[PDB]
């Protein structure tokens, strides 16, 4: 759920920042994201589809 | 430290003693102007959004 924020700097000592909660982790050094209407994988390993919502047959509405 | 800058001190290029500097100032304002462990240089993360 977190990425190593970069600073080549003096030495290779990294910071850590959690990604945007909808942005997953395809690279250890940078988050990744996918289209709107979509979602991150639980381990943030790719794009995931939020389940479609509609007025259902039995709902209160 | 008795220097004389007006005594033709320009290092051959530009004007008014061109400078080495690790990171420029950021006048609009930065979330922390976050310095690394070496204190003479900083990363500018701006005060974007409601955090100004």
From Swiss-Prot, chain A:
Belongs to the G-protein coupled receptor 3 family. Disulfide bonds join 19-31, 34-47. It is found in: Cell membrane; Synapse; Cell projection, Dendrite. Detected in brain cortex (at protein level). Widely expressed in different regions of the adult brain as well as in fetal brain. Dimeric G protein-coupled receptor which is activated by the excitatory neurotransmitter L-glutamate. Plays critical roles in modulating synaptic transmission and neuronal excitability. Upon activation by glutamate, inhibits presynaptic calcium channels, reducing further glutamate release and dampening excitatory signaling. Mechanistically, ligand binding causes a conformation change that triggers signaling via guanine nucleotide-binding proteins (G proteins) and modulates the activity of down-stream effectors, such as adenylate cyclase. (Microbial infection) Plays an important role in influenza virus internalization. This is Metabotropic glutamate receptor 2. Forms heterodimers with GRM3 or GRM4. Interacts with TAMALIN. Interacts with HTR2A. (Microbial infection) Interacts with H5N6 virus protein HA. Glycans are attached at residue 41. The gene is GRM2.
Swiss-Prot record, chain B:
It is found in: Cell membrane. Strongly expressed in the cerebellum. Expressed at low levels in hippocampus, hypothalamus and thalamus. No expression detected in liver. Disulfide bonds join 22-41, 26-44. It comes from the Eukaryota. Belongs to the G-protein coupled receptor 3 family. G-protein coupled receptor for glutamate. Ligand binding causes a conformation change that triggers signaling via guanine nucleotide-binding proteins (G proteins) and modulates the activity of down-stream effectors. Signaling inhibits adenylate cyclase activity. Interacts with PICK1. This is Metabotropic glutamate receptor 4. The lineage of its organism: Eukaryota, Metazoa, Chordata, Craniata, Vertebrata. The chain holds residues 499 to 550 of 912 of the full protein.
């Amino acid at each position: 759920n977190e990425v190593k924020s970069v600073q080549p700097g003096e030495v290779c000592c990294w910071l850590c920042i959690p990604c945007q909660p909808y942005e997953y982790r395809l690279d250890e050094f940078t988050c990744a994201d996918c289209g709107l209407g979509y979602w991150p994988n639980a381990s943030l390993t790719g794009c995931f589809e939020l389940p479609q919502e509609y007025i259902r047959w039995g709902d209160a509405w | 430290l008795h220097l004389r800058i007006e005594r033709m001190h320009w290092p051959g290029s530009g004007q008014q003693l061109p400078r080495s500097i690790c990171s420029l100032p950021c006048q609009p304002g930065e979330r922390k102007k976050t310095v690394k462990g070496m204190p003479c240089c900083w990363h500018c993360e701006p005060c974007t959004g409601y955090q100004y």
